[PDB]
Amino acid sequence: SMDKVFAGYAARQAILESTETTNPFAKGIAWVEGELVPLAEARIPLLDQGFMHSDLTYDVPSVWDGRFFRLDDHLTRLEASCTKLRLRLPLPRDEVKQILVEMVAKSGIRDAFVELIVTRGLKGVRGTRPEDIVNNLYMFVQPYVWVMEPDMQRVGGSAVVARTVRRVPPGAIDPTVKNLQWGDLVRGMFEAADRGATYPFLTDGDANLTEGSGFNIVLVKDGVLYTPDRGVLQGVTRKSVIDAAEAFGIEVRVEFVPVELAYRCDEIFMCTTAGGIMPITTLDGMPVNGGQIGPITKKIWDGYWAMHYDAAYSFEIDY
């Protein structure tokens, strides 16, 4: 049912575009210091510690066909991330939700990438008394972003297990805290391109799989799903994959996933908010179990997008 999903998106894109010459927010909208402004014009202070030392957390809910998807899960993860970094969401949570909906309405964007950022503020942890630290908030709405483009999801992507880089371990930086410190992940993207592939899979350096440059990894083997427990973000897409699998009666094991399972499994897909369910059909230059998108991947694919119209996981925005 990719045709239905992608055709609906192509149609809504054409409409969105024809608003660009008259709606200054049609290419994205940003919230900065309580003002709304076109995304291409948003500026932040050079001295903000979110920039000076990437001292921040963030989270990215999405809108599809005018329905916010699992927004409360994203806001709850954001607050959990903040707590773990000794940050505090600078506005009441219900007010933040209110602003996000309004921002989407003004943009007219029906399929949107939505980002919230909480930074330490203008005074850094080093030599500022904690009582004088004032956290900052930034939010923006932009057109939906594809870690895997629709036309590649019909074909499958190519991945490698990275050998020149490995994932930052939790004892250095907690990967359950969503953060913008992408040094290892960018190295991985460089390595995949050098090796003639699109996506990097990073190990934990101890012969287990973790995650990639903006996605969780799922292996399928003998009808069972396998996905890394430790060392990764606990994605909302992954959580939706788990909800779908259980509804379908497919076993899911969130556990230590040895690198070797990647070379003898039946299917592979990545999952993430900016793109959804993303099949992988070659691994280290070899077809994954024959090279075709697998049946369980397809079932999860359809179940994920179905959830976007399910009131238990979504709500409709008034534009």
Ligand X SMILES: Cc1ncc(COP(=O)(O)O)c(C=O)c1O
Q: What is the distance, to the nearest Å, from the Cα of residue 185 to the centroid of all Cα atoms in its chain?
A: 14
Residue in this structure with the two tokens 């083997």, named with its chain if needed: 221
Q: Is 236 annotated as a binding residue?
A: yes
Instruction: Tell me how far, at minimum, the Cβ of 67 lies from a copy of itself, in Å.
Output: 25
Is the Cβ of residue 54 or residue 289 nearer to a copy of itself in the bound state?
54
Nearest Cα neighbor of 262 from 154, 152, 153, 159 is 159
Contacts of 72 (CB under 8 A, 6+ apart): none
Instruction: Tell me how far, at minimum, the Cβ of 210 lies from ligand X, in Å.
Output: 9
Instruction: Tell me how far, at minimum, the Cβ of 194 lies from a copy of itself, in Å.
Output: 11
Residue 211 interaction partner, one of a copy of itself, ligand X, none, beta carbon < 5-8 Å per kind = ligand X
Instruction: Tell me how far, at minimum, the Cβ of 132 lies from a copy of itself, in Å.
Output: 14
Please report, to the nearest 10 degrees, the dihedral formed by the alpha carbons of residues 186, 189, 191, 195 taken in order. Answer: -170
Three-class DSSP category at 54: coil
Q: Is 166 annotated as a binding residue?
A: yes
Is the Cβ of residue 60 or residue 242 nearer to a copy of itself in the bound state?
60
Instruction: Tell me how far, at minimum, the Cβ of 12 lies from a copy of itself, in Å.
Output: 20
Q: Using the rule CB under 6 A, is 157 a contact of ligand X?
A: no
Q: Is 86 annotated as a binding residue?
A: no
Consecutive H or E run containing 188: helix 183-194
Counted residue by residue, the chain has a size of 319
* DSSP type of residue 274: T
Residues near a copy of itself (CB under 8 A): 30, 32, 39-40, 42-47, 50-55, 85-86, 125-127, 130, 138, 140, 145-147, 165-169, 171-174, 179-187, 189-190, 193, 205, 213-214
Residues of 291-312 as b/e, b for ≥16 C-beta within 10 angstroms? eebbebbbebbbbbbebbeeee
Is the Cβ of residue 37 or residue 152 nearer to ligand X in the bound state?
152
Is the Cβ of residue 81 or residue 282 nearer to a copy of itself in the bound state?
81
Is the Cβ of residue 39 or residue 161 nearer to a copy of itself in the bound state?
39
Amino acid identity, position 199: Y
Angle in degrees, CA 223, 229, 232, rounded to 5: 120
Is the Cβ of residue 113 or residue 301 nearer to a copy of itself in the bound state?
113
* DSSP type of residue 231: S
Instruction: Please select the residue that binds ligand X; options are 236, 244, 262, 280, rule is CB under 6 A.
Output: 236
Three-class DSSP category at 68: strand
Q: Is 195 annotated as a binding residue?
A: yes
Q: Using the rule CB under 6 A, is 198 a contact of ligand X?
A: no
Count of residues that bind ligand X according to CB under 6 A: 14
Please report, to the nearest 10 degrees, the dihedral formed by the alpha carbons of residues 4, 10, 12, 15 taken in order. Answer: -150
Answer yes or no: are the C-beta atoms of 231 and 195 closer than 8 Å: no
- Footprint on residues 212-231 left by ligand X (CB under 6 A): 214-216
Pairing of strands 199-203, 157-161: parallel
Three-class DSSP category at 315: strand
Is the Cβ of residue 156 or residue 235 nearer to ligand X in the bound state?
235
Instruction: Tell me how far, at minimum, the Cβ of 270 lies from ligand X, in Å.
Output: 9
Task: Give the residue numbers of the binding site for (S)-malate.
Answer: 163, 166, 195
Which residues define the annotated binding site for Ca(2+)? 65
Residues lying near ligand X in the complex (CB under 6 A) are found at: 60, 211, 214-216, 233, 235-238, 271-274
